[PDB]
Write a protein that holds these residues in place. Structure first.
Motif, PDB file in Angstrom:
ATOM      1  N   UNK A   1       1.150  -1.507   0.348  1.00  0.00           N
ATOM      2  CA  UNK A   1      -0.337   0.048   0.148  1.00  0.00           C
ATOM      3  C   UNK A   1       0.980   1.347  -0.015  1.00  0.00           C
ATOM      4  N   UNK A   2       0.487   2.166  -0.723  1.00  0.00           N
ATOM      5  CA  UNK A   2       0.795   3.861  -0.960  1.00  0.00           C
ATOM      6  C   UNK A   2       2.110   3.496  -1.710  1.00  0.00           C
TER       7      UNK A   2
ATOM      8  N   UNK B   1      -1.481  15.246  -0.459  1.00  0.00           N
ATOM      9  CA  UNK B   1      -1.557  15.094   0.470  1.00  0.00           C
ATOM     10  C   UNK B   1       0.327  15.840   0.215  1.00  0.00           C
TER      11      UNK B   1
ATOM     12  N   UNK C   1      -1.254   9.343   0.808  1.00  0.00           N
ATOM     13  CA  UNK C   1      -0.627   7.972   2.222  1.00  0.00           C
ATOM     14  C   UNK C   1      -1.631   7.848   3.324  1.00  0.00           C
ATOM     15  N   UNK C   2      -2.763   8.625   2.755  1.00  0.00           N
ATOM     16  CA  UNK C   2      -3.734   8.387   4.349  1.00  0.00           C
ATOM     17  C   UNK C   2      -5.156   7.611   3.176  1.00  0.00           C
ATOM     18  N   UNK C   3      -5.522   6.758   4.589  1.00  0.00           N
ATOM     19  CA  UNK C   3      -6.842   5.685   3.702  1.00  0.00           C
ATOM     20  C   UNK C   3      -7.784   7.278   4.673  1.00  0.00           C
TER      21      UNK C   3
ATOM     22  N   UNK D   1     -11.669   9.168   5.552  1.00  0.00           N
ATOM     23  CA  UNK D   1     -12.393   8.686   6.010  1.00  0.00           C
ATOM     24  C   UNK D   1     -13.387   9.533   6.869  1.00  0.00           C
TER      25      UNK D   1
ATOM     26  N   UNK E   1      -4.249   5.406  -2.914  1.00  0.00           N
ATOM     27  CA  UNK E   1      -3.309   5.921  -2.077  1.00  0.00           C
ATOM     28  C   UNK E   1      -1.929   5.551  -3.156  1.00  0.00           C
TER      29      UNK E   1
ATOM     30  N   UNK F   1     -14.298   2.357   7.156  1.00  0.00           N
ATOM     31  CA  UNK F   1     -13.361   1.202   7.387  1.00  0.00           C
ATOM     32  C   UNK F   1     -14.225  -0.208   6.907  1.00  0.00           C
TER      33      UNK F   1
ATOM     34  N   UNK G   1     -15.257  -0.253   3.062  1.00  0.00           N
ATOM     35  CA  UNK G   1     -13.682  -0.739   2.495  1.00  0.00           C
ATOM     36  C   UNK G   1     -13.680  -2.957   2.732  1.00  0.00           C
TER      37      UNK G   1
END
Ligand SMILES: Nc1ncnc2c1ncn2[C@@H]1O[C@H](CSCC[C@H](N)C(=O)O)[C@@H](O)[C@H]1O
Ligand SMILES: Nc1ncnc2c1ncn2[C@@H]1O[C@H](CSCC[C@H](N)C(=O)O)[C@@H](O)[C@H]1O
Ligand SMILES: [Cl-]
Ligand SMILES: [Cl-]
Lengths: 230, 230
Positions: free
Chosen positions: A52-53, A101, A151-153, A155, A174, A205, A208
């Motif tokens: 991820x990311x 970001x 680089x953040x989820x 929500x 991401x 969340x 997801x």
């Protein structure tokens, strides 16, 4: 034919890809990733999940290009919706991507901008047009819009509002911007495909988790249908 | 000897490096970067600036390793201080690095953590120990601590307080963690060296501009002194 790199971020995004192509894959480790190398309809395909990311996906994309010599990169995975018309399970392709970001506002740079770069990263108009034709022929919706990556989820309503206001983004994830960025630097055509699994809000969340498997399969099936036309 | 990659983020961080080594460099373009290839004291050296931030520096580091076959990576550049004992112009090496802007807290992950990874990224104890010996012999200070890296220029007390509270970071910058991460994935020794040019507070932009040239030279001189012992 031309060698194709196929990327997801998480293992669950590529398991359906490997299954759908159904060919023998050789597993090749490099740089913390496992690349699955196979042959499908006279094309070499190289499949991996990056993890991820932005750093993970930048590394893996760079490896695909430099170590495996892929000639195009197709990304498949799940995303959060920022617009009412993108429902759970719906697909979109990214016309442009931004790193939402990135903030050098201390030096009066626009958000998203880095010196010697650009806010928006372009993808392949040819591959996006192909996706839209396939979707029209399959009689399913396909949105074409801006994807925001960071680089953040995401929500929260507040961050959604920022992404829409600042970048007119349609979805958030991401890895897309970093994959597309690497491809642009090396002159490799790229398409970033996502299926919605959540609404990037306070319930994201749980959504997801509920929809990861189905949305990942939805994207993977559509990616396979693109490869079948390449 | 072993081939050494030398990285900065901005052109101003590598101009003094090229000058200090003083050898002939061949310029080689790849992936949006220009690599300067030379020979110094029986070592091949490859010098580049990545451009700012995590995606740029991940890409360039991956290129250094895959396309140029470097056997170690030394990073030199400027940073913001998070601790009173790191003054303008002071040097530090990163014992560990973290991506301070990574946030998967929606899934109850610690800040900085990504699945299938780790919060802290390690660097070479041998190279850091070498740096400390050289600093002791040159009779100058050298701090050994945590560097926080993210895709924002930090210029506020509130964000400084977060970095210190959450990660016990000593300095902040935008590339170290991603460089060190790539090196770890490929098993390549890495050292991240920074000279302070600002205090990461509300005045940091103006300080950054005032001290860029001197702090970049301070780091570059020290990096050269390390290469002279390798
Ligand atoms: N709302 C959203 N915000 C950011 N990324 C999202 C997102 N919805 C889906 N994504 C994508 O799905 C992943 C979110 S992080 C998933 C972490 C996982 N639940 C775990 O705990 O292990 C990333 O690969 C990202 O690109
Ligand atoms: N306070 C700080 N916060 C984040 N990065 C910092 C920093 N001080 C120095 N850095 C480093 O210096 C650069 C800051 S961005 C510099 C942008 C430049 N003034 C311009 O407008 O073109 C990055 O490469 C980063 O790693
Ligand atoms: Cl959020
Ligand atoms: Cl800040």
């Amino acid at each position: 034919g031309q060698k194709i790199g196929i990327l997801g971020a998480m293992r669950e995004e590529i398991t359906p890809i490997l299954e759908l192509f159904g060919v023998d894959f050789e597993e090749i480790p490099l740089g913390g990733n496992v690349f699955h190398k196979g042959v499908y309809h006279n094309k070499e395909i190289i499949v991996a999940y990056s993890k991820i990311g932005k750093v993970h996906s930048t590394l893996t994309t760079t490896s695909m290009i430099l170590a495996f010599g892929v000639q195009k990169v197709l990304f498949s995975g799940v995303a959060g919706s920022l617009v009412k018309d993108l429902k759970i399970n719906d697909l979109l392709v990214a016309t442009q991507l931004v790193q939402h970001d990135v903030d050098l506002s201390a030096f009066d740079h626009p958000l998203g901008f880095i010196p010697e770069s650009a806010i928006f990263i372009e993808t392949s108009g040819s591959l996006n047009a192909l996706a839209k034709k396939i979707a029209n022929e399959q009689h399913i919706a396909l949105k074409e819009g801006v994807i925001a990556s960071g680089d953040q989820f995401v929500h929260s309503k507040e961050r959604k509002e920022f992404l829409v206001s600042e970048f007119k983004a349609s979805a958030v994830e991401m890895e897309g911007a970093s994959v597309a960025f690497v491809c642009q630097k090396f002159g490799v055509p790229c398409c970033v495909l996502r299926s919605i699994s959540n609404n990037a809000d306070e319930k994201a969340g749980m959504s997801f988790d509920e929809f990861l498997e189905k949305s990942a399969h939805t994207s993977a099936k559509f990616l396979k249908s693109m490869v079948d036309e390449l």
